[PDB]
Design a binder for this molecule. Structure first.
Ligand code: BEF
Ligand SMILES: [Mn+2]
Length: 128
């Protein structure tokens, strides 16, 4: 994928956003911004320019399932790639997110290899 792709990394834990941003940097992506919840994320997204979202689920203000649904319903954002990266592990959770339009789903804790693999899986699917 284009190394100028602009990422939005969303999680209410600074430590997890830091993991994800440093992983992206290793993969060659430096155009990366952070958001602390679904509302914060939508503000950044409405500001424009974003090509990929990586999002947690459990967050105050607006959770990641609601954030995914909001993105998928919005005509200006509807095809935006959204990778869920979450501790939510039940099959029912994966189903709700997949059916809501998740591009991919990674369960915490995850390895560097898993993130790279699942990001590349989305790039291939979308022809990026
Ligand atoms: F708080 Be997240 F869904 F890992
Ligand atoms: Mn969380």
């Amino acid at each position: 994928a284009d190394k100028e792709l602009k990422f939005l990394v969303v999680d209410d834990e600074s430590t997890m956003r830091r993991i994800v941003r440093n992983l992206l940097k290793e993969l060659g992506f430096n155009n990366v911004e952070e958001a602390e919840d679904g509302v914060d994320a939508l503000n950044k997204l409405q500001a424009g320019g974003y090509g990929f979202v990586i999002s947690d689920w459990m967050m105050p203000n607006m959770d990641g399932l609601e954030l995914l649904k909001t993105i998928r319903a919005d005509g200006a954002m509807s095809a935006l790639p959204v990778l869920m990266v979450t501790a939510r592990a039940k099959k029912e959770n994966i189903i709700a997110a997949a059916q809501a339009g998740a591009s991919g789903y990674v369960v915490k804790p995850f390895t560097a290899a898993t993130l790279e693999e699942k990001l590349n899986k989305i790039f291939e699917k979308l022809g990026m």
